[PDB]
Amino acid sequence: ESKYNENIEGLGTATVIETTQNKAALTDQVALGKEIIAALTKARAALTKN
Amino acid sequence: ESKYNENIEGLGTATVIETTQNKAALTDQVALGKEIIAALTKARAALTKN
């Protein structure tokens, strides 16, 4: 949804971007999962603001 | 505050900075994390003086 977020308060959903780029950049099966860990931690972060 | 520390003595309160670079120049869990730890022990010791 564009420009429309819940209520007036600023609770924003707002999924987070990722390290590096290029969904085909890795294919190493490792060096990815670590970024998934870091990701999940960021999820904890952006979740608890709400 | 500008100067103006309680009493006079030798005392002043610490603002613990960080090495490396700006908020936009790291953007990671690993690097930022390690830096945070370093800053934490830095401030830890900085407290136990005075």
UniProtKB/Swiss-Prot annotation, chains A, B:
It is found in: Virion. Residues 4-8 are annotated as: Intercapsomeric interactions. It comes from the Viruses. Homohexamer. Interacts with the connector protein and the minor capsid protein. Interacts with the capsid assembly scaffolding protein; capsid proteins and scaffolding proteins form building blocks that assemble to form the procapsid, each hexamer of the major capsid protein interacting with 2 scaffolding proteins. The N-terminus interacts with an internal region of the major capsid protein subunit in an adjacent capsomere (intercapsomeric interactions) to stabilize the capsid. Assembles with the minor capsid protein to form an icosahedral capsid with a T=7 symmetry, about 60 nm in diameter, and consisting of 415 capsid proteins. The major and minor capsid proteins are incorporated into the capsid in about a 90/10 ratio respectively. Once the capsid is formed, encapsidates one single copy of the viral genome. Belongs to the T7virus major capsid protein family. This is Major capsid protein. It comes from Escherichia phage T7 (Bacteriophage T7).
